[PDB]
Amino acid sequence: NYKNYTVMLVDDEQPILNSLKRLIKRLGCNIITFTSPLDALEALKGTSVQLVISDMRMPEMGGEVFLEQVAKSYPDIERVVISGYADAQATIDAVNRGKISRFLLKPWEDEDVFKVVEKGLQLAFLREENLRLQE
Template structure:
């Protein structure tokens, strides 16, 4: 398996949906699947994930609740919410609390989902590049401060 493949974590309590997603996208992406938010959190601890796609309606933890937990320890993956219900309250919560990138209604359209995954990955790369640049800038600022202090002391 190519290391350059986008890694997607797909979370849904309906096993058929997990099989369908994996069958559709396994050749193009590295696909991890979980039947619950708790199972997904364990996978996030053990894997580097670029994109998280989660169903909203799950028994122990809704998609929004799961994404809120994800944000605390894993802020980098781009988050996408799927739901089969026209539940605008959940969508608003997902945007505000789960900081989702995109909302897709179920049943999903393969081309739309694939396009969304690619746009989400571009966002992931952009955020990673910005984070790296900020870290370099912090290092440069520390070096500059050190040099200025040395000048002042001499």
């Protein structure tokens, strides 16, 4: 049981997407990226995803609105929000009310993404495979 797992990255800033994807690929999992949370929500109806990292501030909707929609339809996905010092307030609220599994402070160190992703992917496994006959 290794990386037949999928990570989704959602961020309107395209250089965040590649800089996260480069780090995360070393882990060997499938990575799908979207600059639009609408497109990301659509893709989730057809594509198995174990972990999503969204940005906090995005045109169509905040990452906390996007991640709450994820929470409600795909309860087993690990939900991670990227947060600046600028987004302190919104991150705390998003936490207080269950919208995100974790947050990733930006600027991060490579070590930080690897950490959030490996741990998160392990917890998505637990939730998915819970109570089900393993073989």
